[PDB]
Symmetry: D2
Subunit: 328 residues, 4 copies
């Protein structure tokens, strides 16, 4: 018994294992778009109903007011560009194709439509390729301020802005890379680490505590609660966070705060280094493949690329002069 993991981005077509009258028919229709999708395809567009846009507007408006005071700098910066380039506005639900093109140009992240909640292994495996499995459906109009399902609103307002940051995109990918071929017990630990970071994480920004977690930036009640005096805020430690018990019904009683994203990424790399695996993995951004470093010769193959990059930088330093250049 040894677990298979994708080694090519197209192999994510095999990583579709899901955790489980008018509204139900619409939900069947949007799920069919996701089931038909194959890597490489343009993400199909959804013509959202007036009720669906009204549901978006309520969520969007309420949370936007809270962002200035509670959201971290990286989320606010990206949210601004998304309002400028990806069609983020109160009267319009953004299209995944527009958002995927934005992320691709910024960090190399791309979106994939998904029918629903993926198994932890397949979700983390996708992140190894800088692919975010996104839902296109929207929650019921009866309960807009609460949703137990990651609906479109959750994804676009909570998960996407942070993926536009180079450091956070590397962190998200690093969790994904660590999961490849890991045991179910370590997938539970990485899924828990993801929960107290990507989902409900907090960060220190110029002596102030801000929210960066998708579950917080997509929930009005939890965004207020996380920065209030009610919860127990602890320093970010990957080992402490991975073994921390949690629930998904009420607000989180414990939140983990990181010094910076760069430091959290360094902490995660140390945690990932003490994961029981007889090999390591390296992402090939050219082919969007996983290189399994399972021998000294596999390491030398990858080292050749790093050596060429250093040659580029050495030549750059020799080319740099005191003269101020004029580019057309």
């Amino acid at each position: 018994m040894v677990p298979w993991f994708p080694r090519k981005v197209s192999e994510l077509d095999k990583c579709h294992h899901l955790v489980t009258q008018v509204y139900r028919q619409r939900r069947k229709l949007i799920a069919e778009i996701a089931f038909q999708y194959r890597h490489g395809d343009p993400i199909p567009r959804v013509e959202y109903t007036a009720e669906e846009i009204a549901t978006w507007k309520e969520v969007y408006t309420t949370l936007k007011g809270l962002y200035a005071t509670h959201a971290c700098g990286e989320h606010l910066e990206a949210f601004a560009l998304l309002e400028r380039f990806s069609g983020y506005r109160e009267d319009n639900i953004p299209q995944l194709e527009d958002v995927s093109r934005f992320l691709k140009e910024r960090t190399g992240f791309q979106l994939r439509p998904v029918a629903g909640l993926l198994s932890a292994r397949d979700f983390l495996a996708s992140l190894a390729f800088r692919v975010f499995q996104c839902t296109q459906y929207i929650r019921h109009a009866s309960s807009p301020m609460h949703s137990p399902e990651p609906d479109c609103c959750h994804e676009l307002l909570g998960h996407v802005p942070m993926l536009a940051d180079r450091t956070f995109a590397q962190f998200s990918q690093d969790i994904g890379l660590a999961s490849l071929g890991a045991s179910d017990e370590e997938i539970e630990k990485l899924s828990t680490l993801y929960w107290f970071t990507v989902e409900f994480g907090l960060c220190k920004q110029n002596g102030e505590v801000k929210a960066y977690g998708a579950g917080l930036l997509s929930s009005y009640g939890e965004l207020l609660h996380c920065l209030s005096e009610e919860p127990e805020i602890r320093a970010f430690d990957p080992e402490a966070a991975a073994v921390q018990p949690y629930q998904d019904q009420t607000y989180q009683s414990v939140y983990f705060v990181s010094e910076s994203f760069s430091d959290a990424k360094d902490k995660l790399r140390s945690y990932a280094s003490r994961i029981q695996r007889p090999f390591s993995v390296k992402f090939d951004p050219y082919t969007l493949a996983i290189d399994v470093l399972d021998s000294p010769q596999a390491v030398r193959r990858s080292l050749e690329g790093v050596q060429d990059e250093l040659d580029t930088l050495a030549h750059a330093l020799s080319a740099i002069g005191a003269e101020n250049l004029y580019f057309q």
Copy 2:
């Protein structure tokens, strides 16, 4: 003033300046000149290319029975010559395109299928182009690992000879070599060296490209094999290049860049490289002595060009290299 160059893969939409040579409208010696059907088809396929914008799926062309018969003639004749004259990297890739990209005598392959193949193998991708691009725009595209590819086919009257780069030339000559990691890096390296260079330097790099990517030879286990696109796509020249008629010289980037040439008859002089790895190392040394007050680095994540023109620009690129080395250090502890 440094000339404008693309810094994002989408900016290749602005790099569409075409060369006007052996044109079916202008040249009365063109085989298709008096063929109104051929000329109409050529107008149609060019319009597909002009409409194309980065991000679009590459349009499919339904080729006529006459067009498939032309493909079949070229494909069959050249395939027979490949076992004895083609280099190992071409033969290996050709066999993989046959089985995964629809390369077969009774079918012209589609650029979308080929682009997906090349992407998975070396990160190269295709873009439809109306015809031959100016040296600057063609080399600028290579800098993003983009190959500007035609979809039209040569007139049915002259199948064994075509001075224009039709889909037979592109698919049989250029594409199999782009499936090799080392050759794909060599081709991107010529492209990166061209970005914002003088016209004089572009002419030198175009001339270097001609003796490597178009008409290059390589030493494979003491034997001389062909790797150039102009040779692997021409029955006549593929035979000529390995005969005792032409003058074969050792590959030197400075010698090749200043060597005069013509595109009418077969090449009289060819340059042979020890290996592709060595040719790339020679190229690095040539590119290092190019007059440029900055350098460039490809970002394969966003398919962008990072202009390294300051110490802060160099640190930002060094950060990535530092993270890659951290990965490799953890790998060595995992193998331990």
Copy 3:
């Protein structure tokens, strides 16, 4: 920019001393009224003044009184080490006992000790007349040079000495400098000081005091002593691990601005998670030091390379590129087969 040495031989110019504790200037010194002790101090100081980089360190023939003082200091502290000293100290102490002549009836010679440290971490000693000014002391550490005294504390007060006598240097400083990580940390404080303002040297000197001099470390959940002043003082070694002092987490910015005294024991101590982590913390502190250049040590020529231009950085990058070529060959040469070396 203040003058700083750029060649190890230029440490011959970094000999500015702090005299406030000397047996001839301080009234409260145990040797003050001892004309014999003061004469001997003058003699051993002359050995240090005559010394020029490259010279073998001259040997001192210690008197029976001086060996008796060593014996008292050595014996008492050796008993406390097993329970209070950090692992790196204990490991090195055992090796110095067996290779550098560390025993109760013999004062070790600096030449023997310098050869030991050279082979272990590249650190070397040079005889110094007394306590050097913060700038000169730190400047020497940048070259992996430890300015070491050869004199010994007065025989009347063997359990306390406010000056860095040979007991302090050999029992306190030397064992920790046999560790590659700690040697790197010591050199890193040294490199950070080169051409820094007097205000920044005062901060770096105070950082040194609460690390190399009176620093504590977490070793498998327990708190151990690594500070030279702790490991060479029986009283201070007991006190630092007792319930009396205030132990704080190591933070370079907090430690550098923390006030202190040199009369009684330290009321506040700083504890580091590991030496590797303390070095990383120091690297961050040193990065936010006001300097219009950076420095890199050349271990081949024992020189300081001032990285003040992109051309300077690419010259240093060439070396790193050659080192990576070495590692790439090794990975291609390595096999699964278990080698037999004669």
Copy 4:
């Protein structure tokens, strides 16, 4: 079994195996054979070298007036030829030794002074040696940036020719080039390649050394100059190497390593390198295809050899490189 090789600079005390070639006791064709005074002096200077143990100060030799007169003849004659025939790196270093290491016609320089000069310049240092060391021990020494150096001087009867490596040969031929950073790296690289290699490989690297360090030529601004120690220490061969008589070939490590040679007359074939930087890159490629199930990395702090024979050994060394890159990244942000 991997042959024993030193892993610490002190272990060079065990790398003292000498060759017996043109010996004043055994060879009756030696100029000093019938000279009992010369033979006694040679015995004396060899005893200084035999007493030497790593860590010792390099002993000084009080040279006789006859010995200084022999030095003067060799020094003067060659110095006149250097301006036109020597490479830039030798000329630059020669001028610095004249001013700092006591290089002058009326004085034989002391190895203690020369070693201190080289240490400050490229990290190279010297050791006194009784005579010519076996190829394995000599190449092993180079791996630690140690040059094993003789202190004796050729017989006064034959000053313009000496088939043995005396002080004139070492100091005039070998030392100035070791003051160049690139050339010092090239010499160490040949030495590191040899550690624990087969005898067949030692013979190849020994021949490579002959066509580079001993009799190499280099292209300097379109001109061919001499950098080889056997050339820069011989008036006759320094003239010959740049004349139209010899066959000059492009430097190729594989071609040079298998090229046959003799030590009686002047070399008929010479190898010319584009630059020292390029020759080092060529040598790296050659060394990469040497049959050794491990590699070796010098630790300049402890002057030790780290045997990279496992992934753990490689990540240990990679840690240092990673720290160096951190330094350089901060430097770029500071400017």
